[PDB]
Amino acid sequence: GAVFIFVGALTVLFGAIAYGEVTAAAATGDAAAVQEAAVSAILGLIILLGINLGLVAATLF
Amino acid sequence: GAVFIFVGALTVLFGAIAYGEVTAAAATGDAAAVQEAAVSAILGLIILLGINLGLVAATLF
Amino acid sequence: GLTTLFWLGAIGMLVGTLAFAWAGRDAGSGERRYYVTLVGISGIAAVAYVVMALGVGWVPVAERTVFAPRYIDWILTTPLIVYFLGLLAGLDSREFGIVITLNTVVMLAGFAGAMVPGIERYALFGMGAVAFLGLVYYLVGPMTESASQRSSGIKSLYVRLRNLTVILWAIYPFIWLLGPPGVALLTPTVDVALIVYLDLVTKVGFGFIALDAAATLRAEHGE
Amino acid sequence: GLTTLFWLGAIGMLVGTLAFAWAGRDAGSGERRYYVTLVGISGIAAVAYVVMALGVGWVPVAERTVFAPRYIDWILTTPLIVYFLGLLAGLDSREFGIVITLNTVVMLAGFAGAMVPGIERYALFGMGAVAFLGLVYYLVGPMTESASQRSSGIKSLYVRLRNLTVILWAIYPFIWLLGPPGVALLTPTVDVALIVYLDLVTKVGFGFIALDAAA
Ligand SMILES: *C/C=C(C)/C=C/C=C(C)/C=C/C1=C(C)CCCC1(C)C
Ligand SMILES: *C/C=C(C)/C=C/C=C(C)/C=C/C1=C(C)CCCC1(C)C
Ligand SMILES: CCCCCCCCO[C@@H]1O[C@H](CO)[C@@H](O)[C@H](O)[C@H]1O
Ligand SMILES: CCCCCCCCO[C@@H]1O[C@H](CO)[C@@H](O)[C@H](O)[C@H]1O
């Protein structure tokens, strides 16, 4: 019940951190640099979704 | 049990789709194009979490 | 690829449709329209996805693209889902008319908003959003009370499907707002992928949950 | 910002430490060890994050940065977590020695691997990964059976902490593999952010679960 809000809020926070690296990379004008930041963000979020699901499974079950 | 495997696997599939757009944009050389694909990927993955958690909440509680 | 995603949607809906048709082949008098309804829900969705996969109905609006068969699908299938929930809840004609009306306003609003440029599209969004809140109220209030006047098995199934419906449908307007019709931060591909996933769960997943409970309902009154 | 994330980790650990210290102020003879252990788990982690936040212990290793205090933290606090679990399970010295040994191999391997260039780092990773599976075996096998022989309250708390521990600890090697020590697909900031989150749950989150159960 309260885990969801926590999980949801941390995800938008990590999302903001990810978007931050991407735009910083974009300010360079180097496409490959943005790609690097982007795959990091993508893999980071997949892992983050794993932590949250794991935290949900460990706490609510 | 079954849901977490389904949810997990679908997360990697959407990840691959997101990564595909990012690399497709990077092949244009346009850093703004990559940033554009990246924010879509980030926001998409966040929405995906909401769906997964929603599904878990719906079918296991 | 967009067309690939549409094909995946079409195949998923088709599998659901056949499974629901097969499962209901021996259904008694009291269960038959529930199976028929499920077949209709995923069958129409199957048509919409095949049509889009064939590259039909892709309407150019300004610089974004609006997939007309998607909203047509929605306008026609969502009231059938509401109808299914209403049968479980045991609604009368009056009560059905209320919730179907609200549902229709939601889907008309979203379609119209997708076709309109500028500030107006948010006004149309607002209409659907408020209508959706009204629909949720009926689903969780009066209709839940109505379902409580039936067997524990029926109420149980109703609650399960209601929770699935309320939770997941609430995700759709965020995809609209962030996607092409809204601020366009989600690419068409990502928009389509998320909706395929949602469409499959809210219709096919919805159906298999109902299917899984059928035997319990049958044993509840002597069989 | 790395130092900001490090600071956030420090603050989180500190709040946890204080909370656990306060909770066990009136603890009896049968509970004192548990609170003291929790204090040590989050307290040491607090020191490591502060040190990193002040920019100390950042080691350059072949085009990547290795955060030494992080691994030293792991080497020292994870056996305390295992110790806590072992107390619940009711282990004796011999059994404790087994699980602490396996745990130590995991942390040493990750640390050594992070500081070694080339394919050797994966050999070191493998050593850690295998020892981790050994540890998981004990937690879900013998230690679970040992915990089952105690009261249902203790058994339930053990299982709850076991599950949190096994599930979330298993995520660390994937971050190691995909992060800077491995294929370096995760930027240092993303790697650090993920680890801060995991550390806080596996120590502070761990503690609050235990506090709730003792209540
Ligand atoms: C099987 C397809 C389904 C269940 C589609 C459901 C779509 C909705 C619940 C859409 C809701 C919307 C709002 C609430 C706001 C305006 C935008 C809409 C139409 C997307
Ligand atoms: C509070 C900090 C904690 C609970 C850290 C736990 C770290 C692990 C479980 C690390 C495991 C690793 C492997 C299993 C493989 C080799 C790489 C390691 C050390 C990261
Ligand atoms: C596809 C899953 C089948 C769900 C069938 C639910 C119907 C169980 O209940 C039915 O309700 C009918 C009213 O609609 C009545 O005729 C009977 O009370 C009963 O047969
Ligand atoms: C916040 C951490 C609280 C967890 C403490 C749980 C321990 C309760 O367990 C106790 O262990 C005692 C020590 O041997 C024994 O006296 C008893 O077996 C038991 O009452």
Residue numbers in the entry:
A (entry chain D), B (entry chain B): 23 to 83
C (entry chain A): 3 to 225
D (entry chain C): 3 to 217
What do the authors say?
The photoreceptor sensory rhodopsin II from N. pharaonis (NpSRII) in complex with its cognate transducer NpHtrII serves as a model system for studying transmembrane signal transfer. This complex displays a 2:2 stoichiometry where two transducers are flanked by two receptors. The long rod-shaped cytoplasmic domain consists of two HAMP domains (present in Histidine kinases, Adenyl cyclases, Methyl-accepting proteins and Phosphatases23), which are followed by a methylation domain4 involved in the adaptation processes and a signaling domain which harbors the CheW/CheA binding site5. HAMP subunits contain two amphiphilic helices (AS1 and AS2) joined by a non-helical connector.
In this state, the HAMP domain adopts a compact conformation which has been correlated with the active state of the complex. This conformational state is made possible by a high flexibility of the linker, especially in the region of Gly83-Gly84 amino acid repeat. Indeed, replacing a small glycine by a considerably larger phenylalanine would limit the ability of the HAMP domain to rotate relative to the membrane part of the transducer and thus forbids the ground state. In line with this reasoning, our data on the crystal structure of the NpSRII/NpHtrII1–135-G83F mutant demonstrate different crystal packing. Although the crystallization conditions were the same as for the wild type “U”-shaped complex in the P64 space group, in this case the space group is P21212 giving the “V”-shape structure similar to those observed before. The previously published X-Ray diffraction data on the NpSRII/NpHtrII complex only showed electron densities for the transmembrane domain of the transducer but not for its adjacent HAMP domain. These crystals of the wild type NpSRII in complex with the shortened NpHtrII (NpHtrII1–157 and NpHtrII1–114) belonging to the space group P21212 revealed an overall “V”-shaped topology with an opening to the cytosplasmic side. In the previously determined structure of the complex (space group P21212) quaternary structure has a “V”-shape and there was no possibility of interaction between the NpHtrII’s HAMP1 domain and NpSRII.
